[PDB]
Ligand binder design. Structure first.
Ligand SMILES: [Zn+2]
Ligand SMILES: [Zn+2]
Length: 329
């Protein structure tokens, strides 16, 4: 088996230290149209400086969760990978339905069809044709480029799975059946994981093939244990996001799952989606933050609370991503 990166399929042992959910260069139509400039990562050289910080700290791989509705700049990301040496796992599929109001860029029309918005495209395209689109991103390349995606994604809304969202879940599940690519989901504020899981079960998807994004947004031990029992990977990707929770709260939730025997299912990242989050755009914590500052604190705090901090860090950033992001064949 293998992990599919922009520059080739690699052995799991080659993945190394990994951030499991990030954004690098992207210009989401929905946000661009609303002049939300902070959500546009629109400078390749600035993004590259953060990725280089990661590389300098011993980082090896970034999973780039930018989906088709989030304004990919695949060629820029590929160039960054080439220049920094950081391996990139790209993402096929969809991010979240509120983005679908955004206009379809000219480059997508030859691939997707002559549709004004993502909503129009998704509403008027059969599930099977949506599956074809996702499969082609994994097998042929993203957005007319030769850089293939290494995971397939879908997303749901705040305490909602709409009919169209459900359609995309089924399209992505079926794309998994064809390609065997790992599956990632967006949960809005950490909601709807159990309902996502029910749809995937109807589609005959083994749940250990799924990583669920944004579990750190809903810090509920009972809910987390319900999700973990299915075998799904659980992504804590809001590290440093004090506006959502203090770091202690995220760390406590992680350690609860460890105490209940689920350490092998935990993934960690920063979901760095803003200029103000990048060191070299707006002087935020940057891609350096987790490796440089969070890791030593987690190790220390976990050790203080009786855990094996170093072993856990190795699992969260090395062993677990190597298990999660391998194709299922
Ligand atoms: Zn997301
Ligand atoms: Zn994201």
């Amino acid at each position: 088996s293998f992990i599919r990166t922009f520059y080739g399929d690699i052995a799991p042992e080659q993945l190394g230290f990994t951030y499991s959910h990030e954004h690098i260069v992207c210009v989401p139509a929905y946000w661009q149209e609303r002049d939300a400039d902070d959500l546009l990562l629109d400078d390749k050289e600035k993004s590259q400086l953060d990725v280089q910080d990661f590389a300098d700290l011993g980082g090896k791989t970034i999973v780039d969760a930018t989906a088709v509705d989030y304004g990919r700049r695949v060629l820029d990301v590929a160039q960054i990978s080439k220049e920094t040496g950081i391996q990139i796992v790209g993402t096929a599929g969809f991010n979240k339905s509120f983005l679908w109001d955004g206009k379809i860029k000219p480059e997508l029309k030859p691939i997707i069809g002559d549709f004004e918005t993502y909503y129009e495209w998704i509403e008027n395209t059969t599930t099977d044709k949506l599956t074809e689109f996702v499969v082609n991103e994994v097998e042929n390349g993203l957005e007319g480029t030769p850089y293939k995606a290494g995971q397939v994604k879908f997303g749901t809304g705040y305490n909602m799975i709409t009919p169209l969202e459900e359609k995309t879940i089924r399209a992505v599940a079926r794309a998994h059946h064809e390609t065997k690519a790992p599956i990632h989901s967006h949960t809005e504020a950490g909601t709807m994981a159990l309902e996502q899981i029910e749809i995937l079960k109807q589609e005959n998807i083994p749940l250990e093939y799924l990583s669920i994004g944004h579990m750190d947004r809903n810090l509920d031990p009972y809910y987390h244990k319900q999700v973990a029992k299915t075998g799904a990977f659980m992504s804590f990707d809001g590290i440093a996001k004090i506006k959502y929770a203090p770091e202690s709260a995220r760390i406590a939730a992680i350690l609860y799952l460890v105490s209940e025997g689920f350490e092998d299912q935990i993934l960690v990242s920063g979901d760095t989606a803003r200029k103000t989050y990048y060191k070299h755009y707006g002087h935020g914590p940057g891609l350096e933050y987790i490796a440089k500052k969070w890791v030593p604190r987690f190790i220390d705090e976990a050790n203080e609370k009786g855990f094996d901090g170093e072993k856990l860090v190795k699992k969260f950033f090395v062993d677990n991503p190597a298990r999660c992001f391998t194709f299922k064949k």
